[PDB]
Design a protein around this ligand. Structure first.
Ligand code: NDP
Ligand code: NDP
Ligand code: NDP
Ligand code: GTP
Ligand code: GTP
Ligand code: GTP
Ligand code: GTP
Ligand code: GLU
Ligand code: GLU
Ligand code: GLU
Ligand code: GLU
Ligand code: ZN
Ligand code: ZN
Ligand code: ZN
Ligand code: ZN
Ligand code: ZN
Ligand code: ZN
Ligand code: ZN
Ligand code: ZN
Lengths: 495, 501, 495, 210
């Protein structure tokens, strides 16, 4: 929302891009070894940079639905694909009334830069259907999801090797299940990869472990990597580690709740949670599980016992870490001054506007940009896609073999230690650590999701941090990120 | 593009539809014998129409091209598909800087209804690439139109059973030629109907006789059928025939030049011709050839020796028939009062605003509506598609059979007569008249394109007259054309038993 | 053919399935989250089950063959596909005159539950062709299976992502190689996975190590996993292990032979072999490699030097383990009373009728059921399909790197120890044991085939045992299997 | 490219092949356990080697290129597919005026055998374009390698599951980046593995280290 700082979402992310585009400009220029030198290069660079920014394809739908009561209602929807520099395109399907071609455009672009930060080989994309799901029956919501999949399918805006959609606001397993089902029942009847057409699926339908809670978990890993970095924690004026920290969470959805779950888990105190009808609060702590229970029970977080109803912008709560996990453009120049938190964890997609970004920097609020924080989603969606493509549960073929080998490896250290210390040593049992015993059959699917996500969110955190320090962006983490997203994408477009 | 009457093209055309949807609502309801009677009758009518109105699909593209000097430039373009109630979608590609999503949506809807009026079984579509072709080389234009065909091809917005493009403003044969080749050379390299993927092609690449000229030829018939409906020539205050009549045309590309040739030929005097940089005028007349000649050499019509450069909007020139045949929204509430013409033939696509539309109605100016008049284009496009689907030129297999059969038919008349009138009659030579001698091998391609277009514009015109009189619309020819369009498209959504569930 | 207990195969298998369902009906109901509680919980469950029982599709075929002699012959055939809850369907091709639509239907249903038991991601399907393969030429058997492949191709009853057939009775490597070719020749000419359209292929033609041997090798594992659980050999009244044990095998084909090989390899004495023209028998042992050479050289077992022509049902031979490894409905209400063996290992497909299952139950005779026991097949079939998908022989790219990794790994233990124990140790070599020497390069293909199979069979063995006890089924191992197969297929059915 | 020791390239490899095939012919017959043994095995070995030697498919192309001066030039080109005993076929693209159907047939036969030596699961294939790339501009070269690819794809002579090329003399990363792009862009937009339609590509376009 916010009426004086409601930039057009696409141009806004275009802004973030352009910014980062400038600081690399000299770097990218000097990289490229084009013989025709001088400034034919500098044009070449903003020439390529001028193709990256715009979306390649955007598909607008109007299709009819027969409502439950029997009337005919026409549904509109869009899907934008921002890049093909990596095939296929990846991106969520969101069901809200805010959906416009433009927010679907900005979201898609965001997805391209996102996957670049996080070394996921997808071009960005995104869909939206202009319905408030709440206002439709489950049966209607089904018809809408299916017909919208048929439209995307025929015009080639879904398909495992074209465009793998995924969840977003007001969509989850359920919908992806229908998407995956009408795709694979019509267009995909022959595709050996028909169920790699969408991600976020029920595990029972092709899904992967922890894909619901994966963007939350990646939020945590993203926060952790910085909060445990003394360089930024000096500058910020706070203690390393999660132990003393308090945080608030805007939105209690897929990334809202699970961000709370993992942050609460490793020691952070969740004092407040908000939703579209109000917030709640308690600086002695809200427990995610109790709150989740109460919310599933009473469809609302409000009136939760162990926390008062908080009157006012939950974004402005006193806390260490502010985590927007709702829609975009919520921390703006209007309310950026009075935010109170020292770390903004952009769990949501593009939730703080550039005007706010400016205040936050000279206020020395640290913004972990959505670019890097909520990529835990595609990264596991990339894992889910890879699972579908490989047609095996990770570990299935190697569990026993790895179990046995580690055992004989361990045995070799033993039989060799006894071969030397004849009997002064005696019999020297070499046994797996309790933790190496969990790790003894090799990585299961779960293990890959957990560890692969952790590696990802740190390897990327490091090269963001390194790029902040190489260009002296200090706490403008977003600008280092785009600098890395650009650098990686630009490398494709010229080489 | 006006300003203080610059309505949204797509919504504008919705209004033209909505107006006719209301004249028919009672009839559609009456006809529909859904047992579920009463008003859930009406609502299902109201509900169907709400499904006819929006475009089904709209594709927006950004793609780069390597411009000739090595620079990269990002080209944008769109194509909208209004309806599938008939397949494929049919509609043109337009290269202007006016090209927006909302334009391309309006044009599309306009093409759906246009086909319903003239019984051409196509849903409506239309594309635009947002460039000024006058600013790029032939090389860059080729690059740009093929990539567009590529980008359309991949997402299902070009294809013979899917969506057959065509020429519009600043595109023609040359572009269609590239569009057919790039399509047929990639996505279509095994399609037996690869080249039915677009109309407006050169004759030599699958094109049909007089496709270029046919939109204007259609304008001609469409004016003829009304200007000789004594009924309407009465109310208008004119005389039947083209005989004394006088006309001006906005535009001198595909639709202007040929409407001008064809009216000139059947006696009407052309007194003015406009293009973007200005107009030229002469009440004694301008010759369509000399003007075309002058234009092909000089790049403009301004300076044509046998005419004065008019100062002021060609739409206001004193004539009988003004022919908007340029871009849309040229006749608005600003300039509608000042039109001097008594018949406006809407050769262009959406040239009249609805506010201007009321003014002409109130001013007793009969606007032949786009819906009907400029349908010459599709109808022959539709023939070009039939031509590609059948992989024979018309007649090719029956010419010698028809000739022989006719000769033998006539001989039967003769021999039978001679048998009766033994010798008081003698030999009674039954010979083809001169004109039947031309028609004696049956129809050539050109014959079909000519006679079939004629049939379509006559049949649809009387349908439009019959309907305007039944509903006492008088000179509201546009809504009568929309009341027909709706009746037909509605018939399709209705009889379908359902549509989906 | 038993003239007084020949249930229609499909209904018979529906009985097994019905049986298991009413056991978990209460279970499926309680788990089912459904807001709409009550018995419209029960009825959705039973409706879903009512969907699972019937085959989704059946293709009946008539196609002419011109015989070697130049005459015309109308060959009938069938493929039934029972479930698509996993794509592709999997299942063998059978050449017999027993092949009827109802038999094919039952076998296909048996495939979907079979893969459910062993966690092989395939819906089930099965095809037969109503021929006596003994009555046709190699050339005629090629025209037939090639044209059958074409009939199956053109109607979507074969394809690497739609339905992957494999061997069964009177088909094998040589027929699979034709199917694979005929498919990949035509339809699949562009398919990167044309060769994964069928399993059982020769190894040079995309096949996998030990897939001929795979099924009985799993018969061995499946017996083994049960013959070593004291809980079950107690109840039985037998000693654990293969040590003292004795078995007879109906069928000496691809299941019978290798079942007999591997059991023999690990102790047990094979005392009877039988086929369709008789049985042999020798209580002191029938060596499998001998019987093979003799079989191969004589096209029969009867009159094998080292055994006597047994007269009387091989199903009633005195032994510990009876292994039906031929056709279905061999063990029926008439002769189940007279079976004498304590463990019936169903390597065949549906060898035991339900009335005979009942008799076996109350006679305290443990029938290890087809559903689980002969799923060694699909499992190794699964492995090859993946092999074909992954376009690499297992280990090819990692052998050298793993070798050096382990040597440096050990070398790390060596030098770490020598750094501590300066010269009080002196030189402390750390070397692979012989067993870790063999694994020191990582798993070969056969490594995976062998350990993957074994893993699959022990794990599936357990979850059957686990189910039996929780449901107090005792020896009704079959109902335990169906209960897992029903459990697993259900739960895919979520919208 | 010599004088009086310049054998037909294809036959020169057939020569090598034929030699190493008598060395094993005895072994192959002894191997094959066919029940109709005899010389009816010696010859069914003779038949099988007779099918291996000749390329299964050769495609000769003439296609036009608009040169940079505007003129039209008919550019000559070939890809031979030696064997499908493993799909897809594998083998490079050579830009040279020595390119002939026999040279390219030979390089093709050399490539299946090269992949057998190192157990690379591809039947051999090779391609040549009869041009001398020092005489052409990069833009021309691009115009060529792309149009060559479009012709290859429509006739089934490139494709990740059917035939995958690679670099060779006067080709490399750049032309690999072109082929990949024109195939993926046209014939295989829906093909998940489109960019596996050729090897040697730039690291950034799907290529590999080293
Ligand atoms: N995999 C993913 O889901 C990923 C999501 N994101 C971004 O995360 C954000 C949320 O995704 P998700 O959590 O899945 O959406 P959900 O539908 O899962 O839940 C979203 C929550 O946000 C609340 N909300 C939305 N707008 C506001 C607002 N203006 N003020 C207060 N509360 C609000 C909703 O409340 P109510 O229910 O009352 O409307 C709901 O509780 C989106 O912006 C998405 O783009 C980023 C990366 C990955
Ligand atoms: N098949 C067809 O071609 C059909 C076309 N139509 C409609 O007819 C109209 C034109 O079609 P077409 O003739 O093909 O397009 P063209 O590309 O042939 O150019 C038409 C003419 O319009 C002139 N023009 C453009 N804008 C203006 C303006 N603002 N004021 C005055 N003159 C102007 C151009 O002059 P300059 O070159 O100086 O811009 C040109 O001479 C469009 O609306 C089209 O949709 C209708 C039916 C079928
Ligand atoms: N991968 C596989 O092959 C799998 C097979 N199965 C099941 O195992 C059984 C057979 O498999 P397979 O070994 O492949 O079949 P085969 O074609 O290999 O022949 C099986 C054996 O059964 C014998 N036989 C057939 N009918 C009778 C009969 N009425 N009485 C006695 N002996 C008979 C045959 O002898 P004769 O030559 O005299 O008929 C032959 O020795 C079937 O139920 C099959 O579905 C289970 C899992 C997988
Ligand atoms: N809503 C909700 N989700 C949960 C809860 N516990 C676990 N999950 C998520 O649901 C999935 C199943 O949980 P587990 O099987 O225990 O897996 P896990 O990786 O050990 O769970 P976590 O480490 O907490 O993410 C995981 O992705 C969890 O993140 C819970 O109490 N409520
Ligand atoms: N632009 C332009 N087109 C012309 C001219 N003369 C004829 N044509 C068109 O080119 C095509 C070939 O002309 P003709 O072979 O005479 O065909 P036609 O049907 O007899 O031509 P018309 O009856 O004059 O339309 C027809 O579509 C004509 O409309 C001209 O002078 N200028
Ligand atoms: N039919 C048949 N198969 C055999 C015979 N000997 C080995 N095999 C199978 O043929 C395949 C190739 O054998 P090997 O290369 O020796 O591999 P293996 O994994 O050691 O096979 P196993 O002896 O079962 O452990 C394996 O599946 C063997 O089971 C035999 O004598 N007859
Ligand atoms: N032509 C050329 N290639 C080089 C040079 N240095 C490295 N490369 C190649 O660049 C690729 C990446 O090289 P490096 O990043 O140095 O890593 P590498 O795997 O050690 O490569 P090698 O030095 O060949 O062992 C490898 O293919 C190298 O062979 C060089 O100086 N000239
Ligand atoms: N839409 C999610 C990612 C969804 C996905 O591709 O899995 C995001 O904005 O990051
Ligand atoms: N632009 C033309 C195209 C007709 C066609 O050829 O489809 C029209 O609006 O009628
Ligand atoms: N007929 C085999 C099929 C095994 C396979 O799919 O390879 C079975 O019953 O399991
Ligand atoms: N053309 C090279 C390599 C071919 C390839 O990489 O496929 C050769 O002669 O082996
Ligand atoms: Zn549609
Ligand atoms: Zn997890
Ligand atoms: Zn594109
Ligand atoms: Zn004509
Ligand atoms: Zn047939
Ligand atoms: Zn083995
Ligand atoms: Zn060609
Ligand atoms: Zn290297």
């Amino acid at each position: 929302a916010d009426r004086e700082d409601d930039p057009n979402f696409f141009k806004m992310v275009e802004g973030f891009f352009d910014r980062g585009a400038s600081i690399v400009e000299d770097k990218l220029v000097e990289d490229l070894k084009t013989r025709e030198t001088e400034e034919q290069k500098r044009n070449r660079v903003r020439g390529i940079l001028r193709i990256i920014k715009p979306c390649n394809h955007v598909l607008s739908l109007s299709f009819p639905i027969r409502r439950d009561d029997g009337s005919w209602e026409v549904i509109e929807g869009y899907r934008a694909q921002h890049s093909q520099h990596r095939t296929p395109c990846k991106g969520g399907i969101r069901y809200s009334t805010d959906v416009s071609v433009d927010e679907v455009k900005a979201l898609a672009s965001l997805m391209t830069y996102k996957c670049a930060v996080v070394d996921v080989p997808f071009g960005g994309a995104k869909a939206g259907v202009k319905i408030n799901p709440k206002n439709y029956t489950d049966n209607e919501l089904e018809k809408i999801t299916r017909r919208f999949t048929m439209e995307l399918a025929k015009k080639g805006f879904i398909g495992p090797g074209v465009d793998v959609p995924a969840p977003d606001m007001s969509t989850g397993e359920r919908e992806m299940s229908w998407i995956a089902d009408t795709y694979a029942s019509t267009i995909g009847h022959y595709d050996i990869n028909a169920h790699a057409c969408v991600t976020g699926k029920p595990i029972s339908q092709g899904g992967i472990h922890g894909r619901i809670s994966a963007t939350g978990r990646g939020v945590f890993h993203g926060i952790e990597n910085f909060i445990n970095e003394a360089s930024y924690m000096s500058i910020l004026g706070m203690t390393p580690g999660f132990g003393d920290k308090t945080f608030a969470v805007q939105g209690f959805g897929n990334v809202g709740l699970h961000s709370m779950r993992y942050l609460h888990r490793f020691g952070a105190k969740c004092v407040a949670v908000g939703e579209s009808d109000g917030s709640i609060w308690n600086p002695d702590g809200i427990d995610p599980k109790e709150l989740e229970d109460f919310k599933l029970q009473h469809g609302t977080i409000l009136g939760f016992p162990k926390a008062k109803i908080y009157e006012g912008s939950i974004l402005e709560v006193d806390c260490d870490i502010l985590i927007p996990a709702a829609s975009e453009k919520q921390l703006t120049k209007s309310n950026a001054p009075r935010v109170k938190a020292k770390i903004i964890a952009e769990g949501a997609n593009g939730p703080t506007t550039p005007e706010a970004d400016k205040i936050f920097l000279e206020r020395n609020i640290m913004v972990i940009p959505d670019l890097y924080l909520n990529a835990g989603g595609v990264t596991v969606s990339y894992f889910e896609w890879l699972k579908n493509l490989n047609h095996v549960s990770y570990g299935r073929l190697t569990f026993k073999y790895e179990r046995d080998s580690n055992y004989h490896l361990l045995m070799s250290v033993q039989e060799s230690l006894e071969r030397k210390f004849g009997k002064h040593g005696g019999t020297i049992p070499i046994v797996p650590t309790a933790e190496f015993q969990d790790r003894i059959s090799g990585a299961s699917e779960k293990d890959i999701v957990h560890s692969g996500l952790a590696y990802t969110m740190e390897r990327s955190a490091r090269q963001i941090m390194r790029t902040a320090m190489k260009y002296n962006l200090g706490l403008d983490l977003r600008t280092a990120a785009y600098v890395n997203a650009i650098e990686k994408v630009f490398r494709v477009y010229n080489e």
